[PDB]
Ligand binder design. Structure first.
Ligand SMILES: *[C@@H]1O[C@H](CO)[C@@H](O[C@@H]2O[C@H](CO)[C@@H](O[C@@H]3O[C@H](CO)[C@@H](O)[C@H](O)[C@@H]3O)[C@H](O)[C@H]2NC(C)=O)[C@H](O)[C@H]1NC(C)=O
Ligand SMILES: *[C@@H]1O[C@H](CO)[C@@H](O[C@@H]2O[C@H](CO)[C@@H](O[C@@H]3O[C@H](CO)[C@@H](O)[C@H](O)[C@@H]3O)[C@H](O)[C@H]2NC(C)=O)[C@H](O)[C@H]1NC(C)=O
Ligand SMILES: [Fe+3]
Length: 348
């Protein structure tokens, strides 16, 4: 079985993956599920092989035995010309973000406001913010800390899904895939933009990429960096350029995961795949661009140069950073989920 079956979360991702299968002559094939958690289960069953994952999902899969194959990697300023696949990863910034126009809203007045989150269990969208809010307030009731949210993946009869828009017909509110208008990085920031929420937790890179003519997408052509601000943990606010000084935390980059018995096959298949279709591969754009989704972030984030190598053969823990595994761990004392419970024994 040479083919690497890839896991597409949601129908929009499934289409780009069907495309990739066709271009790759079945070097890659598609399986899908509605959610990432579901996909992780296919990867476990052996029904799929691999998929690229936010660091928080990496911890879920990590727990269930899956391991990290190659990290997503983006442009760089520091050391900005060693080869992409061997150049170390620099992480990204998880930020709290607001309309500038609104005032009196700051980290310390967040309680009882309205939130837009990438989706539940994700790193910047969720794990970091809710992480801190737990440590600070000192209670496990983050489900009630904000007045309402969009938090795809949460309980959809609950308040954390109260603000989610669903798709075009409004079907499937709160399903944590790209058919939910406010899903993921782009989704969250848009939930902010349309004033459905007060704060939105995202990465620095997400505001720059959807303001000031960078997206030519109806919801975001006219958006202006000026109209937004970043809450720091100071109590303070700064514009988006000071993100380095105004960020909640540093996050580990998305990364591909698979089963260990499938890691090397997958890593190799992918390295060739990116050479074919990656940022500067033979066939991109003449044929297929693996890293472009028109700002919809499918399979991969659109600002990925290449998938890069990892020091040794790490585990979720080496890969994520021991500092983060604890932040996630401690947040997770306040809530259970099917997959961590079902897999808890593997890692005891
Ligand atoms: C589908 O998968 C295979 C990966 O197994 C790709 O075929 C392999 O492609 C390399 C080209 O990178 C083939 O030739 C190479 O030639 C250079 C010399 O110019 C040499 O340095 C290499 O050692 C190698 O001989 C290689 O033979 C080939 N393997 C097979 C079994 O065909 C193919 O590109 C993939 N196709 C798509 C659409 O992704
Ligand atoms: C937050 O995210 C934004 C966007 O991801 C970052 O801005 C980007 O910064 C890089 C360099 O740090 C820019 O690339 C540069 O391009 C010029 C040529 O135009 C070149 O001379 C430099 O050597 C470098 O390659 C990139 O264009 C820029 N993108 C945009 C749309 O502004 C920003 O750095 C991030 N902020 C923090 C604090 O990390
Ligand atoms: Fe993330």
């Amino acid at each position: 079985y040479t083919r690497v079956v890839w896991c597409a979360v949601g129908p929009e991702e499934q289409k780009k993956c069907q495309q990739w299968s066709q271009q790759s002559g079945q070097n890659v094939t598609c399986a899908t599920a509605s959610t990432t958690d579901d996909c992780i289960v296919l990867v476990l069953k052996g029904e799929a092989d691999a998929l690229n994952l936010d660091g928080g999902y990496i911890y879920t899969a990590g727990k269930c035995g899956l391991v990290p194959v190659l990290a997503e990697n983006r442009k760089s300023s520091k050391h900005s010309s060693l080869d992409c696949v061997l150049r170390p990863t620099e992480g990204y910034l998880a930020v709290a973000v607001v309309k500038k126009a609104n005032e009196g809203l700051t980290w310390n007045s967040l309680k009882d406001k309205k939130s837009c989150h990438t989706a539940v269990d994700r790193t910047a969208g969720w794990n970091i913010p809710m992480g801190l809010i737990v440590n600070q307030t000192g209670s496990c009731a983050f489900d009630e800390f904000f007045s309402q949210s969009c938090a795809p993946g949460a309980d959809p009869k609950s308040r954390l899904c109260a603000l989610c828009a669903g798709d075009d017909q409004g079907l499937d509110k709160c399903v944590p895939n790209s058919k939910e208008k406010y899903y993921g990085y782009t989704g969250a920031f848009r939930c902010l933009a349309e004033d459905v929420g007060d704060v939105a937790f995202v990465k620095n890179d997400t505001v720059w990429e959807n303001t000031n003519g960078e997206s030519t997408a109806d919801w975001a052509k006219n958006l202006k960096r000026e109209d937004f601000r970043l809450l720091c943990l100071d109590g303070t606010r700064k514009p988006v350029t000071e993100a380095q000084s105004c960020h909640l935390a540093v996050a580990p980059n998305h990364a591909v995961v698979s089963r260990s018995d499938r890691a090397a096959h997958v890593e190799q298949v992918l390295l060739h795949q990116q050479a074919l279709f990656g940022k500067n591969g033979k066939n991109c754009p003449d044929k297929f661009c693996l890293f472009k989704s028109e700002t919809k972030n499918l399979l991969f984030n659109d600002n990925t140069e290449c998938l890069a190598k990892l020091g040794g053969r790490p585990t979720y823990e080496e890969y994520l950073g021991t500092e983060y595994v604890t932040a996630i761990a401690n947040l997770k004392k306040c809530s259970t989920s099917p997959l961590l419970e079902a897999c808890a024994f593997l890692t005891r």
